[PDB]
Swiss-Prot record, chains A, B, C, D:
Signal sequence bounds: none
Superkingdom of origin organism: Bacteria
Binding-site positions, ATP: 32-36
Function: Component of antiviral defense system Gabija type I, composed of GajA and GajB. Has no detected ATPase activity. Expression of Gabija type I in B.subtilis (strain BEST7003) confers resistance to phages phi105, phi29, rho14, SpBeta and SBSphiC. Expression of Gabija type I in E.coli B (strain ATCC 11303) confers resistance to phage T7.
Identification of the protein by name: Endonuclease GajA
One family name in Pfam for this protein: OLD-like_TOPRIM
Lineage, broadest ranks: Bacteria, Bacillati, Bacillota, Bacilli, Bacillales
Length: 454, 454, 454, 454
């Protein structure tokens, strides 16, 4: 009914590897040698045209031909009654099922080297316990395992359960057709069990209810796995979420921002300081009007460094007047595992408006920041950075001398707020190298120093 | 010194094709046969390891084995004294240069079929005029053309000028390394002459001073070419321009927007109306705070349908108070080839502020719109759409009944203005199929009827 | 210890074939396809690098994919205590040996088709009886049969018993190398079990103690076998016998003569009548001073037509004077399975000599011939022809009119008798087409009419 | 009209090789590398599909890439008016014929290395003199030479003049079909120009009017050639002449005998002395009733050692009585280039007959031998051996002690004469090793010590 785990011992570059699985699996990384071995590992266990030729000297670990090779596959058998496929793996097998309440099933493969003839044999056994495993009946060249499974292999560079193995279906396909392939794989019910390997981010636009395996750049002994499943909510904005995350899954360091105003400034600063930041990992990700939980959990389970920078903000509850909600603190606290805060009510006379209103709100926000220093201390530990009022004010504290030479006028922080995009473009046009060097080193913009590396 | 043109007559699927070129050339599209044929055609003229083997029956047009196969290459010879490479193509050639003031040079290739032996000979001829072409001297198996050029071929599926040919350098490369390859090709001087074929948009992140050739989906007889050159005024925003345009170059129809507020709404509307829009062409492009000339010229020269929807706007000139400029109207006139309009000065008493100020500005904008009916009528012809105030007011005229059931409050158009992102997310969460179909059919949103198709 | 028989049922072009064998076997004939299939038949039974791949549609009979394929090999197990290899085939097997006093052993191979998967399975079984055959134990990919035998394949165009299979070892070898190879195979003890296929007669110059298999030109249903073993009496003339018979084994019709005088005449007559007699089978073989048993038995066991023509002769027993022995008559009788006749004593006065003695001997020979008409008539039935005196007399009775025009003189038969080679050369020089046609039709030379054809 | 010679310089293993030729040529020997190179040498000069690819480092001599490669072919042009092929080679070429009375034509090929590009160019040049050679006109990829000749290559291991090149047509052919191929090659007029390479003696069963080329076992610098053309006076013994020389052409040491009586003795003697006499060359050849000139000239031109042993003999002239001729002495004098001797007349009374007649003739032969000692002295220099009476008498002088222990009786030399074959086969049976060692060393049998080697 469902795959559960796979254990590989002493096979090529695998020393002792334990990987969790599910019905739909997607593997990626920067190894390109372990990815092509993870599929031969599965083919030597469930395929016939490749098991006839036994192991050779190279197929072991680093040419130490005195150790065993074990491969074990674990399957969960719970729907004893309503499952259509559980009957087939309970009718062909009739003696390894000691009890009618086993709920687990195993398949194993062992190999021991024969020095005299330069040949390594393959022996297959299954059972329902780790201690009592019995051999597969079968006469001639056909085992009893081949009567249950059928394996199909797809590679463009050249009444049974069907298992698909696709390798790199993007060699000579246009960008449009990759989306069609993704839709077919992840939506229609033609495919149920498969494993997939890819280097392009256009195959993962409709990913849902699957498992993701990431391979680190180091020795193959490390592989990480996570279960991806979107919620019932966040269902009206699924396309944007997947389009944002599909490219960040291929990185090593990712920074989360709010809007396109910060993208221009950060791109200019990085270009002036060091231009080769996207070659050595690195990425900039836009979140928008959504909480950070979905990105953070997915990135943390796969060992991806994550950096978050945000600003304090206030919203007015609909209907009621004079009552405000703390959104910036709530979004940062919801990630550490805590509860929302009570609303704060503030009073402003009707006559006061404009900059007088803005300064009152800024003073209130500064007081709120003053009250919760201990929380900010714990926020900064887990790569969460919070500003006092906004980004523009922190910018004014680093390049303020050069701010009053382009806009002239007065109070340039107020001048930017009128139009965020055009005036930021004007500001970035008229900036020297010294200004970017000064921005890159100030404390309030420390987050960038963690994107480039230690 | 510089390539200028290439003419192909009766070679495979080419009937009569005339393509402009330059030193750096990039070819792309959806017709995969035509690109391979183009690069083979370029090899029967400058490489000896492929010209030994003459033409066969298939190498002609649709097996009409009675027509000539002619290929002519055109080169411009202007730097008669300063170029270090013109001397080489004036030293080896000594008779075709009738006058020391030619400024143009040709290379030609002709072939006629020999029925008796089933073979097609290849005859080579250069000259400096189209009427007087002489034969190339050479004894044995080596021509005089091979003493000037050397051709190098790269394909991962396997004292002289050097010409590089690259075919699909992304078959098994990670995402990071494609950027490094793009940098090396487009910045360093190791490569000076090359032709490239690609399907991935990450190779075109540093493109500058090149020619782009697009191949349509129809018969190969159609191919379009354009010269890409970024100005010195749009510097420091180059890295974002290229990342925006590199994906749009692979489409057949593109819509231009302003910010991320419109992306969410349009994605939801399209998802409810018809979910397969990015497969049959289709793309959404973000512009930001920049004029539309750079995108529009590039997209028009290559035969890509372009759609523009923008809103009216005003700005306050720095320093002077009470004077405003017409940015939205101006940005739609530079594209038609006209001059900027004169500033408009308006007066508002100091006491009046807030919503009363906003209604005064809206009345002024409506009055401005009331005087330029002919301009808007001419704008709409070239696929440019203008709204009276902004997108939200246009939205209120179609789904107004459902606006006052989520936010409640009053005058929800003002409510959205407080926070563009969060409130639009809340709006899109609470919407039904009927609401989206009502947006898709209204007149004031006619733009979406051209991105879907005809 | 010794192979005994092999039975093939429904394999390619074999319908029901039963072939006797021995330790050393040599296969030849005109049908190359059958000689190639006869070795795959053994490889599918004793080799594992070819048995992994099961049967296909073609490997059956004429695409009737509903019949069994049975292959049985029979081995004789008698040297229970003296043989050093009977132990290895009595220790590995421990349950199929029902009694310790059994002589024969069997190895069988069966296959039944599986229509659903398009694959035929191979099942192996031995036993010491034809009614009770058990399955061979083995786990994984290794049977118990592979622990006893090892098969080696040799083809220039590319503690266990060893079986060699040699195919066409004369592709690019010189003549002396062929003779050396023949010596190595048939003399030294390095090779003990092998099967050999050949098209050249130089490998068979010292064949001794072997089994010869001949393949007819018709359907494979016919194959003939004979055990070749030379006697100890014919040990001083072994080389000449083998060199004479090694070329005749590749024919379909063979004629036996006495010496080189009977070769020139027959070659001239055949050349004048029809010059294509060696393409369509045919051969002339010289015997000399031996008996005909050795050639006749070997040729008759392999289905080769044999023709014998001889002349009556008398020779004197050493020591005793006046006593003569019947040689030709006894040599013809020894082939039908009878006993030698008694000596005949004749008296001649000392004075009588010269031609008178010759005419007396001729009269005596004529009387001896007249005594045995029934014996001559029984000789003629089994392709044995006997002349009254000699070939010269029959040639005279055929062409005397032309014989008395070259030698002139008188009694030309005597003139031939003085010197045989030179006078026969002179005679054959001066002959016409009419004379040769006259020789070919006379009754006394009927033997030639049987060599050419029916 | 006729090929005449070929000169190869500095090509592979050829240093300076000069070979004569004709229309039909057959090449053989032991050096299997030179035989292939001799046929690639004729394809770089006349074949288009192999000359496109230039020389490499290996195609030179022992990797010394600073010397020229020249190939010249010589063709005789005499039938200026009657030949239907001389017109073609005088019409296509129209400027190299300085005079209409040249009678000789040349074709040449030169090549000089180009170190920079690692390539060797091929330049072609014909002419009717060795001093004035002009270049061959032609534009593109087709020369003027390709309009006259066409080349065909045959190898089973895979209005123009046609040249065939056959390589080893005996790989998988039956013995009967080789004769069929020989008849077509050497009789019918379909083939006129060809070269042939072979290892089997059955292809040369009808050779007439050809050239034979033999390659020695040493370095390729040695190659011998001869013209084979049978006379019209040997036309009735042709089918037998070529069935004995064909096998001898593959040897290095050949001995000539008269009949099978000597074969029986010599085979046993050699078997007892040393059995591996046929691996290291060596062969016995029967001549019969013909002169030795035809064999001796053919074997001498090809550098084959020849040994001749003959016995004295007398014959009676037809018609006349009492007059005798000296056949044996004349057959040895004819080969040294002399004239036949006069007849000798001897008288014998009618009464004397039988053994007395034989002893009178033996005394006469002994006197004749005594007369001509000087001639025998010169005969023995050129490997011609003569005996006084016969082989039997010389045998009696070496093993006489053992002669009178098998036949007993008396005068065993007379006893053998009555029936040579049946008594020699009995003598050979009853002979010990010491008896055979005593024939191999005696002076009268010095011929056997030169066959085995020095």
């Amino acid at each position: 009914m469902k795959f559960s785990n796979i254990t590989i011992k002493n096979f090529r570059n695998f020393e002792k590897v334990n990987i969790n699985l599910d019905n739909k699996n997607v593997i990626f990384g920067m190894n390109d040698i372990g990815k092509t071995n993870f599929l031969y590992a599965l083919r030597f266990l469930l395929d016939k045209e490749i098991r006839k030729f036994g192991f050779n000297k190279s197929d072991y670990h680093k040419h130490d031909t005195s150790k065993k090779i074990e491969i074990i596959l674990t399957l969960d058998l719970s729907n004893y009654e309503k499952d259509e496929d559980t009957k087939k793996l309970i009718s062909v097998v009739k003696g390894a099922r000691t009890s009618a309440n086993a709920d687990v099933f195993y398949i194993a493969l062992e190999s021991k080297y024969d020095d005299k003839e330069l040949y390594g044999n393959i022996i297959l056994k299954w059972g329902s316990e780790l201690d009592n495993l019995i051999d597969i009946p079968g006469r001639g060249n056909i085992n009893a395992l081949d009567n249950v499974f059928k394996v199909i292999y797809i590679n463009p560079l050249v009444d049974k359960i069907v298992i698909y193995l696709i390798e790199e279906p993007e060699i000579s396909l246009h960008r449009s057709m990759q989306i069609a392939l993704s839709k077919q794989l992840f939506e229609q019910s033609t495919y149920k069990y498969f494993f997939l390997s890819t280097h392009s981010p256009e195959l993962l636009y409709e990913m849902d209810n699957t498992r993701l395996i990431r391979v680190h750049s180091t020795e193959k002994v490390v592989c990480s796995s996570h279960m991806y499943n979107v919620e019932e909510a966040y269902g009206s904005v699924k396309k944007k979420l997947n389009k944002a995350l599909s490219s960040a899954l291929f990185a090593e360091r990712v920074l989360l921002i709010e809007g396109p105003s910060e993208k221009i400034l950060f791109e200019k600063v990085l270009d002036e300081v060091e231009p080769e930041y996207e070659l050595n990992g690195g990425f900039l990700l836009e979140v928008g009007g959504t909480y950070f939980n979905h990105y953070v959990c997915t990135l943390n389970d796969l060992g991806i460094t994550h950096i978050i920078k945000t600003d304090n903000d206030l919203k007015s509850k609909k209907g009621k007047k004079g009552v405000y909600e703390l959104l910036g603190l709530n979004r940062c606290l919801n990630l550490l595992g805590r509860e929302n805060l009570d609303e704060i009510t503030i009073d402003i006379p009707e006559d006061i408006k404009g900059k007088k209103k803005k300064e009152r709100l800024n003073e209130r926000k500064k007081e709120i920041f003053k009250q919760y220093k201990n929380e900010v201390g714990e926020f900064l530990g887990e790569r969460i950075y919070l500003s006092e009022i906004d980004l523009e004010n922190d910018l004014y504290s680093a390049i303020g001398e050069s701010m009053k030479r382009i806009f002239e006028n007065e109070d340039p922080v107020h001048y930017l707020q009128k139009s965020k995009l055009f005036n930021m473009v004007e500001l970035v046009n008229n900036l020297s190298t010294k200004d970017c060097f000064d921005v890159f080193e100030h404390e309030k913009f420390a987050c960038l120093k963690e994107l480039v590396g230690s």
